[PDB]
Amino acid sequence: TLVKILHHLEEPVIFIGALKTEPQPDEDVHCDCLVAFGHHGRMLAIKASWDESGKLVPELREYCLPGPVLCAACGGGGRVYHSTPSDLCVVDLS
Amino acid sequence: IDDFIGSGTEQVLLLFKDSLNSDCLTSFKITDLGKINYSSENRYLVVPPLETGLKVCFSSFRELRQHLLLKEK
Amino acid sequence: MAVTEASLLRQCPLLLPQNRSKTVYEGFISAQGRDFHLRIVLPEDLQLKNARLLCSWQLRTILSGYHRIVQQRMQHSPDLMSFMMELKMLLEVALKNRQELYALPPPPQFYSSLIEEIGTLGWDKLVYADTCFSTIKLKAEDASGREHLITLKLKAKYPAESPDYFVDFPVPFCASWTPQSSLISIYSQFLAAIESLKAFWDVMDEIDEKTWVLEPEKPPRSATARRIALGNNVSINIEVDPRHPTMLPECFFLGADHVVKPLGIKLSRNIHLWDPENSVLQNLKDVLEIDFPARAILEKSDFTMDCGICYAYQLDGTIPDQVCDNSQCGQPFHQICLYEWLRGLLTSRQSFNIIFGECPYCSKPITLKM
Ligand SMILES: [Zn+2]
Ligand SMILES: [Zn+2]
């Protein structure tokens, strides 16, 4: 010199990242998925489908994982390491 | 109280008396009070499933409480 | 009803006209015992050609990939009534096609009742349980002292519906499930079927031990055929009737035209000496008048019973079975490799399911029956 709305999780966002789902060293991996986290423990995931109607369609999940999520990171091969005040847990999307 | 193993979780160390020897940390007892226990599986088999049962049902509980508040509104 | 005065209430109970002029509908729509938030603004008139339809983000996430269908139904559809009918049925289909997102079990009946039945069973039987408590796998023993596993996959309601039972053994298990029947009932059915088959198991385990199982390798418990090795570069495979194992199985010999004949002739003359009181091996010994080699392995660790075309053992399950009718070659082959080769040749003529040609190594007449 415009801003676009995607989803609105009901709770505060904590971590936004990207994964390599279906992984079938190089620092730039062509990332397949998109991940968001809530505080209250709503996880969101998105992927490309291209199935049934012969068109790319956006595939949304929303998981509700336990406990008030305090942090997270992503690790090699579609893995996300996240933390509740009880325990440190993981999710595998591969 | 600390993690002496390097497992992640804290453990309790208990030292028995100086009548045994005139030496420090002889006659010890390290314990998690779960599985880890050092000194001088139908039980340990179906437990994580049961834990995860609590977690699933705790999520449903809290979800429905959110749901209830929505209906009031 | 006929009029959408009452029919709307009956079929969308939780839609509350907010304005006096029935122009702002709000509230919930039902689906598979699940309410979803919705505000459906109409114009000053009753037109769906033009209407607004806004959601909760849960709702939009679920109707991702039908936004167009939604717009089409708004513009093509007559009234609001049938609009909601179609929308609802569509939500039903969206969810069932995403069935994998569901199944909160009821804990006051589930986790407790399941542990109570595991108590009733005993903790020497169970072998596997998933952290979500969906999949289980159990052991029982034969009188022979064999471990037989059984996987069950249980639903949100186990006692209500039948647990899907997946089991190794060959013939199909049928489980008379009542909601009154339990894990112990089906375990007893499993023991019953087990003790029923034991004879067949005794026969199969006796062959795995005292003979050179060839085609199956660490065979599973569903397998009723057994490709046995006997002499050298001749095999016999046997498929066994699970109900009548001791009874005569279906039998035949692979190998040399000159080797296989006397086996066939001996089989024809002796088969009456077959007797279903004995074991399959004890009957074979007296019918075929021979004893079996027990894994003649280390001596001939590169003798090449292999294809002699691709020079490999084990082509895509297939084994070198087709041989030469010659004392000087005896060179085995694959069905695949010998067909592919002989197809090319001038000399090769095909009758109905057979190809005559020259053996690659020795150039003598060799026959292939597909
Ligand atoms: Zn071959
Ligand atoms: Zn030959």
User: What is the 3-state secondary structure of C305-366?
Assistant: CCCCCCCCCCECCECCCCCCCCCCCCCCCCHHHHHHHHHHCCCCEECCCEEEEECCCCCCEE
Residues 6+ apart with CB under 8 A from C283: C246, C274, C275
Residues of A with CB under 8 A from a CB of B: 10, 41, 64-66, 88
Look at C131 and B49 and tell me if their CB atoms are within 8 Å: yes
Read off the tokens for C267.
């089989």
Residues 6+ apart with CB under 8 A from C355: C339, C342, C343, C348, C349, C367, C368, C370
Rounded to the nearest 5 degrees, what angle is found at the Cα of A20, between the Cα atoms of A41 and A46? 50
Alpha-carbon gap: A23 to the closest alpha carbon of chain B (Å)? 28
Q: What is the rounded distance in angstroms from the CA atom of residue C333 to the CA atom of residue C321?
A: 6
Which residue is listed with tokens 């509980």?
Answer: B61
Q: What phi-psi label fits residue A65: left (phi over 0), alpha (psi between -120 and 50 degrees) or beta?
A: beta
SS3 B37: strand
Q: Give the neighbor-by-neighbor strand order of the sheet with C234-239.
A: C225-230, C234-239, C250-254
Read off the tokens for C317.
């399950």
Residues 6+ apart with CB under 8 A from C89: none
**Cβ-nearest to A57 among C57, C61, C65:** C65
Q: What is the rounded distance in angstroms from the CA atom of residue C319 to the CA atom of residue C300?
A: 17
Q: What is the rounded distance in angstroms from the CA atom of residue B42 to the CA atom of residue A86?
A: 26
8-state DSSP, C162: P
Backbone angles phi, psi at C54, to 5 degrees: -115, 160
- Please give the radius of gyration of chain B, using alpha carbons only, rounded to the nearest integer: 22
Tell me, what amino acid is at A58?
Answer: P
Q: Which helix (H) or strand (E) holds C1?
A: none
- Ligand 1 mean position to B49 CA, how many Å? 49
Partner A contacted by C100 (CB < 8 A): no
Residues 6+ apart with CB under 8 A from C107: B53, B57
> Looking at chain B, which residue has its C-alpha nearest residue C36?
B67
- Please give the radius of gyration of chain A, using alpha carbons only, rounded to the nearest integer: 15
Alpha-carbon gap: A32 to the closest alpha carbon of chain B (Å)? 28
Listed in order, strand segments (DSSP E) in C223-301 are: 225-230, 234-239, 250-254
Task: Report the length, in residues, of chain C.
Answer: 370
Q: What is the rounded distance in angstroms from the CA atom of residue C55 to the CA atom of residue C36?
A: 8
Tell me, what amino acid is at C279?
Answer: S
Burial of C155 (0-12, 13-18, 19+ CB in 10 A): middle
Interface partners of C (3+ CB pairs, < 8 Å)?
A, B
- Ligand 2 mean position to C330 CA, how many Å? 6
Read off the tokens for C194.
């087990």
Residues 6+ apart with CB under 8 A from C270: C286, C287, C288, C289
The answer to whether C362 and C326 are in contact (CB under 8 A) is: yes
Q: What is the rounded distance in angstroms from the CA atom of residue C242 to the CA atom of residue C233?
A: 29
- Which residues in chain B are closer than 8 Å to C118, comparing Cβ atoms? 46
- How were these coordinates obtained? cryo-EM
The answer to whether A11 and A42 are in contact (CB under 8 A) is: yes
Q: How many Å from the N-terminal Cα to the C-terminal Cα in chain B?
A: 48
Alpha-carbon gap: B36 to the closest alpha carbon of chain A (Å)? 18
Partner B contacted by C115 (CB < 8 A): yes
Read off the tokens for C132.
């979500």
Q: What is the maximum span of chain C, computed from C-alpha positions, in angstroms?
A: 103
Q: What is the rounded distance in angstroms from the CA atom of residue C263 to the CA atom of residue C253?
A: 8
Look at C104 and B60 and tell me if their CB atoms are within 8 Å: yes
Q: What phi-psi label fits residue C348: left (phi over 0), alpha (psi between -120 and 50 degrees) or beta?
A: beta
Task: Report the length, in residues, of chain B.
Answer: 73
**Cβ-nearest to C61 among A10, A49, A60:** A60
- Which residues in chain C are closer than 8 Å to B53, comparing Cβ atoms? 105, 107, 110-111, 133
8-state DSSP, C172: P
> Looking at chain B, which residue has its C-alpha nearest residue A10?
B66
Tell me, what amino acid is at C304?
Answer: T
Q: Give the neighbor-by-neighbor strand order of the sheet with A88-92.
A: A71-75, A79-83, A88-92
Residues of B with CB under 8 A from a CB of A: 8, 55, 58-59, 63, 66
Which residue is listed with tokens 């209500």?
Answer: C160
Q: What is the rounded distance in angstroms from the CA atom of residue B48 to the CA atom of residue A56?
A: 39
Number of helices (H) and strands (E) in chain C: give both, helices first: 9, 14
Q: How many Å from the N-terminal Cα to the C-terminal Cα in chain C?
A: 69
- Going from the C-alpha of C89 to that of each of C40, C71, C96, C97, C175, the distances in angstroms are 17, 16, 11, 12, 34
- Ligand 1 mean position to C308 CA, how many Å? 7
- Ligand 2 mean position to C37 CA, how many Å? 79
- Which residues in chain C are closer than 8 Å to B70, comparing Cβ atoms? 37
Q: What is the rounded distance in angstroms from the CA atom of residue C219 to the CA atom of residue C338?
A: 28
* Ligand having the closest approach to the CA of C333: 1
Partner B contacted by C37 (CB < 8 A): yes
Partner C contacted by B56 (CB < 8 A): yes
Q: What phi-psi label fits residue C322: left (phi over 0), alpha (psi between -120 and 50 degrees) or beta?
A: beta
* Ligand having the closest approach to the CA of C319: 1
The answer to whether C170 and C241 are in contact (CB under 8 A) is: no
Partner B contacted by C104 (CB < 8 A): yes
Which residues of C sit in the known binding site for Zn(2+)? 307, 310, 324, 329, 334, 337, 359, 362
Read off the tokens for B8.
């992640």
Rounded to the nearest 5 degrees, what angle is found at the Cα of A53, between the Cα atoms of A51 and A54? 65
Q: What is the rounded distance in angstroms from the CA atom of residue C117 to the CA atom of residue C181?
A: 11
% helix, strand, coil for chain C, step of 5: 30, 20, 50
Q: What is the rounded distance in angstroms from the CA atom of residue C161 to the CA atom of residue C369?
A: 51
Q: What is the rounded distance in angstroms from the CA atom of residue A19 to the CA atom of residue A74?
A: 7
8-state DSSP, B19: T
- Going from the C-alpha of C126 to that of each of C135, C198, C277, the distances in angstroms are 12, 21, 35
Q: Which helix (H) or strand (E) holds B39?
A: strand B37-39
**HSE (side-chain half, CA atoms, 13 Å) at A53:** 9
DSSP bridge partners of C238: C226, C251
Rounded to the nearest 5 degrees, what angle is found at the Cα of C364, between the Cα atoms of C361 and C369? 95
